[PDB]
Design a protein around this ligand. Structure first.
Ligand code: HEC
Ligand code: HEC
Ligand code: HEC
Ligand code: HEC
Ligand code: HEC
Ligand code: HEC
Ligand code: HEC
Ligand code: HEC
Ligand code: HEC
Ligand code: HEC
Ligand SMILES: [Ca+2]
Length: 593
């Protein structure tokens, strides 16, 4: 809500409440009815005393009989149509300061005047002063970068607070506390359960010209803020750090470069930036033996490592994993592999050597299908460079895994279908920091080399296909805190928001109402039994006692796995179908990146 103006005589009298509205085309006249909403604040920057910007809350809260100068929408001052009003009193708990910044906000959750009826909630701020440009500010961080992991954010019965901000109530003045002051608080909350490493600052402290003030997560060291993560330290007592009663000396020692570096990982990344392992070519014979050619190089500068991996001292580990059957999600739950340093090559010279992976399972009718490869490794580094893995105080970093797609004769660029992307997962995990099994971190592939339908699922369990280590099952299941060993794991965003993980198949999202080649073997561990292709996936986010199984054709457990596969085509899709239908994607909340 672009607004106007500051009311200076002798009270708050907010004069406009529109029209950016809730949701629609916009630029349409609106009517402010009929609930909520208001709050005011005063910040001083660093005048008291020698530390940081502070907000201060003027009384705004619950009420019984409908009133102006607090939290509600009633016996206020004249409001209607567009240009509203208005506050009572001024300096309640604190006191107004000439030549200072201040804060205003407005939200709208509505049972409307029978004219439209909506929405959930919608807020926007207006920071004020007594008639001049803008002295100083505290624009630390916007909510959208928060939404990457949360999609939408709205605490307190979703009442607050779309956008910015909550710095209003979460002050020393309003909250009690402790510590529910914004920096103090949200650090402590994300201290554990955070996907990425806590030391990743820009994941929240994103870079943004719109926010002139910060440049701050490392400009302004303070007990309360830094101590939130660094808990084992009691400053005033000298526990774990030299005693400090205040934060008047923090900065003298903790310069910006220092605090910005200690949390940075530039050293790690520059070391890794000096090594790359790519599969230059590949092929396979009829019975199932792969021949790979590996080319080690320095990605920057781009020159070759003439010697083979087994002679490069800085390599801690480097493996390739492979499997066959891209069109049907592979033929084994366990991919074959080789540890390159642990094996002398067949042929090679000058930065490129051939090895061969054997023991792959090639079912008959699938001689012309595609396979899958995935590099995996660790290198020892120290002080931003690679070093002999036996050097003192060396650290073991993890190669960014990668995958090439296989073909009986030579590498192919097409490969197995793309259901998700490292991009989409990084919006919570990072690209590509999430490491499982030590060194595996590719999600656009690799994981499925083992996490495929070949992964058995418990028939005994009342649980429907949430025992299958199939990638789709595993992922959906654990990010729902339902998968075994993954209970009580709090998932930030909307579980139902498909957009986060999924992606486009040249058209709609990769949850196309009709799968392309999702071979379905969802029930094993008992083996004999199997389950419908589409019912397979929906039974985790629409779990048990149900459906009835509301089971129309194809829908079922075992039936010769033929009546299961797939069997024919079935209306189960046509009904919940892509083209504008009685379900498809309208049924799920999905947004754009
Ligand atoms: C991904 C790295 C996230 C970023 C970016 C933000 N949040 Fe988050 N949030 C995330 C996780 C994994 C969790 C829970 C972990 C756990 O073990 O509890 C949360 C939780 C919250 C909460 C709820 C706290 C509660 O007690 O329920 C809040 C209010 C919250 N986070 C706020 C918040 C804000 C304001 C963010 C932008 C600055 C933000 N989060 C970013 C994951 C991630
Ligand atoms: C004033 C209307 C507030 C707004 C705006 C926001 N919060 Fe709040 N919250 C408020 C109070 C008075 C309290 C507790 C008071 C006390 O003395 O303890 C809280 C509490 C929280 C908590 C945890 C404690 C709890 O009672 O649940 C969290 C995690 C929290 N608040 C988060 C939060 C976020 C992320 C906000 C911006 C979207 C936000 N609050 C705004 C009052 C107010
Ligand atoms: C999301 C969970 C964050 C993480 C991860 C980090 N920071 Fe943070 N920080 C975050 C918020 C929402 C706020 C307050 C926002 C507001 O408008 O008040 C802060 C605050 C700080 C501060 C205080 C700065 C000031 O000017 O007072 C500091 C010094 C700070 N944060 C440091 C910091 C560092 C070094 C981080 C990486 C280790 C870091 N934070 C992570 C959100 C999040
Ligand atoms: C959570 C978002 C944090 C906040 C807020 C602050 N720090 Fe931190 N710090 C955090 C992590 C995850 C780490 C590990 C570093 C690593 O290499 O893994 C650190 C580390 C430090 C250190 C190094 C101490 C050591 O034992 O080697 C220092 C000196 C440090 N951090 C300082 C510091 C300051 C001054 C902060 C406020 C501006 C601060 N940290 C906030 C996580 C978080
Ligand atoms: C010089 C006398 C300092 C003053 C004043 C402050 N800090 Fe300090 N700090 C100093 C040193 C030499 C170190 C060791 C760091 C290392 O890598 O060995 C530290 C450590 C910290 C840390 C690290 C936390 C951890 O768990 O390791 C933090 C978070 C930190 N310091 C913050 C901090 C604060 C809040 C201060 C004001 C109260 C402060 N420092 C003052 C040197 C000095
Ligand atoms: C934010 C909405 C997320 C998206 C996008 C993705 N994941 Fe996630 N995942 C998220 C959180 C907050 C956690 C915390 C778990 C914990 O115990 O802290 C996780 C966890 C995982 C794990 C577990 C790893 C382990 O426990 O060792 C895995 C393997 C994982 N996530 C994978 C994964 C994939 C493949 C994603 C893209 C499809 C993905 N995640 C996205 C939150 C979020
Ligand atoms: C074969 C070489 C595998 C590849 C490649 C990946 N995974 Fe894995 N994983 C594999 C098996 C056989 C199992 C179950 C039994 C076991 O040996 O551990 C798992 C288990 C998991 C789990 C949960 C178990 C745990 O470690 O706590 C997760 C969260 C998981 N797998 C995820 C995962 C990811 C993200 C992968 C790509 C980075 C990946 N796996 C590859 C075998 C294999
Ligand atoms: C991150 C936790 C995700 C969420 C949220 C949703 N999906 Fe997902 N899905 C995710 C992964 C990592 C996979 C693995 C598939 C693979 O081979 O890598 C899947 C799989 C599916 C599929 C299979 C489709 C196909 O293989 O062609 C479907 C149909 C599917 N998921 C549906 C779906 C829907 C409707 C979602 C929103 C409610 C949704 N998923 C969320 C990761 C994640
Ligand atoms: C996890 C990623 C899911 C997948 C896979 C599927 N859906 Fe789903 N959907 C999911 C959740 C967590 C919810 C919440 C429903 C609620 O009431 O809160 C939904 C919602 C639906 C519904 C609504 C049914 C009801 O609420 O009674 C339908 C009809 C629906 N989704 C359709 C649907 C279909 C046909 C799926 C297979 C193609 C499917 N969903 C998968 C999460 C997930
Ligand atoms: C047309 C007759 C359909 C067939 C065939 C299938 N589904 Fe369906 N389903 C359809 C509608 C119009 C609805 C209403 C949902 C709503 O929110 O209005 C549903 C409902 C479901 C649900 C919801 C169950 C719950 O929330 O508890 C589920 C889980 C579901 N449908 C799954 C499902 C499966 C697996 C199907 C193939 C066996 C299937 N449906 C077929 C329309 C139709
Ligand atoms: Ca900036």
């Amino acid at each position: 809500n672009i607004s106007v103006d500051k009311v200076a005589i002798s009270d708050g009298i907010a004069q406009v409440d529109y029209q950016v509205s809730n949701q629609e085309n916009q630029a349409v006249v609106g009517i402010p009815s009929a609930t909520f909403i208001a709050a005011q604040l005063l910040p001083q920057g660093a005048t008291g005393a020698g530390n940081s910007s502070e907000w201060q809350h003027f009384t705004s809260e619950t009420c019984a009989a409908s009133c102006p100068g607090t939290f509600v929408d009633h016996k206020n001052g004249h409001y209607s149509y567009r240009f509203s009003a208005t506050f009572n009193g001024m300096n309640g708990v604190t006191f107004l300061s000439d030549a200072t910044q201040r804060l205003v906000i407005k939200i709208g959750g509505d049972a409307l005047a029978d004219g439209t009826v909506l929405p959930i909630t919608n807020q926007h701020y207006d920071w004020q002063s007594s008639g001049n440009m803008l002295a100083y500010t505290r624009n630390l961080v916007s909510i959208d970068t928060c939404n990457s992991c949360h999609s939408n954010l709205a605490f307190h019965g979703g009442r607050y607070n779309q956008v910015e901000t909550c710095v209003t109530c979460h002050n020393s003045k309003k909250v009690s506390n402790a510590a529910d002051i914004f920096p103090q608080m949200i650090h402590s909350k994300h201290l554990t359960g955070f996907p990425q490493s806590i030391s990743n600052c820009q994941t929240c402290h994103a870079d943004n010209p719109d926010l002139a003030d910060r440049q701050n997560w490392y400009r302004v060291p303070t007990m309360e803020a830094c101590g939130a993560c660094h808990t084992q330290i009691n400053f005033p007592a000298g526990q774990g750090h030299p005693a400090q009663t205040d934060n008047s000396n923090c900065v003298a020692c903790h310069n910006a470069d220092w605090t910005a570096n200690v949390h940075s990982n530039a050293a790690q990344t520059s070391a890794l930036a000096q090594f790359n392992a790519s599969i230059s070519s590949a092929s396979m014979d009829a019975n199932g033996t792969i021949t790979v050619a590996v080319s080690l190089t320095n990605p920057t500068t781009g020159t070759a490592y003439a010697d083979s991996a087994d002679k490069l001292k800085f390599i801690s580990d480097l493996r390739i994993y492979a499997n066959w059957g891209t069109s049907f999600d592979y033929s084994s739950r366990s991919a074959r592999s080789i540890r390159l340093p642990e094996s002398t090559p067949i042929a090679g010279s000058n930065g490129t050597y051939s090895y061969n992976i054997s023991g792959l399972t090639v079912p008959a009718g699938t001689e012309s299908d595609r396979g899958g490869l995935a590099i995996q490794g660790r290198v020892c580094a120290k002080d931003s460079v690679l070093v002999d893995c036996s050097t003192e105080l060396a650290e073991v970093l993890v190669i960014k895994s990668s995958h090439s797609y296989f073909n009986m004769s030579a590498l192919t660029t097409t490969g197995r279908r793309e259901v998700i992307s490292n991009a989409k997962c990084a919006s919570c995990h990072g690209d590509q920091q999430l490491n499982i099994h030590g060194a595996r971190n590719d999600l656009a592939g690799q994981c499925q080399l083992c996490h495929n339908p070949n992964m058995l699922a418990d028939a005994t369990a009342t649980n429907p296909s949430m025992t299958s280590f199939d990638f789709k099952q595993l992922i959906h299941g654990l990010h729902s805190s339902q998968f075994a060993g993954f209970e009580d794991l709090n998932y930030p965003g909307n579980i139902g928001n498909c957009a986060q993980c999924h992606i486009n198949d040249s058209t709609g999202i990769s949850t196309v109402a009709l799968p392309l080649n999702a071979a379905v073997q969802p029930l094993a561990l008992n083996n004999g039994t199997f389950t419908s292709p589409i019912a397979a996936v929906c039974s985790n986010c629409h779990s048990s006692d149900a459906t009835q199984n509301h089971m129309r054709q194809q829908g079922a457990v075992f039936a010769g796995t033929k009546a299961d596969a797939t069997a024919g085509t079935e209306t189960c899709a046509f009904c919940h179908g892509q083209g504008t239908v009685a379900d498809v994607l309208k049924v799920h909340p999905i947004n754009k990146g």
